[PDB]
Amino acid sequence: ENQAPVANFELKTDGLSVSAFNYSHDEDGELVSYAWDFGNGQMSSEMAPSWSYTRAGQYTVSLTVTDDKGATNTTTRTTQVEVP
Ligand SMILES: [Ca+2]
Ligand SMILES: [Zn+2]
Ligand SMILES: [Zn+2]
Ligand SMILES: [Zn+2]
Q1: Which residues, 6+ apart, have CB-to-CB distance to 1 below 8 Å?
Q2: CATH class of this structure's domain 1-84
Q3: How far is the CA of 28 from the centre of ligand 2 (A)?
Q4: Given the DSSP bridges, would you call strands 17-22 and 31-37 parallel, antiparallel or unpaired?
């Protein structure tokens, strides 16, 4: 009766630069890994990455988290970045 982990985040945008606040957690265990796709061909295994887009646009950012039993969940959010 493992509970699958909770994937969640919020983005902070500053022109084309973005930072992630990671709210992911496991109610009954621990998170072991993080897999981000920034929607522009760039990816990360960091918990709370900072990145920058090279051009303005709307992108889908995805985060997959894994718990201590190997269960996963994915949450995605669109974001918009503009040149300053
Ligand atoms: Ca769990
Ligand atoms: Zn919770
Ligand atoms: Zn803990
Ligand atoms: Zn604007």
Answers
A1: none
A2: mainly beta
A3: 9
A4: unpaired
Which helix (H) or strand (E) segment holds residue 77: the answer is: strand 72-81
Resolution attained, angstroms: 1.3
Please name the method used to determine this structure: X-ray
CA distance 34 to 48: 9
Instruction: Give the number of other Cβ atoms within 10 Å of residue 65's Cβ.
Output: 26
Ligand nearest to the CA of 23: 2
User: Which amino acid, 23?
Assistant: Y
Q: What separation in Å is there between the alpha carbon of 70 and the centre of ligand 1?
A: 8
Neighbours of ion ligand 4 (CB under 5 A): 82
Q: Where are the domains of the chain?
A: 1-84
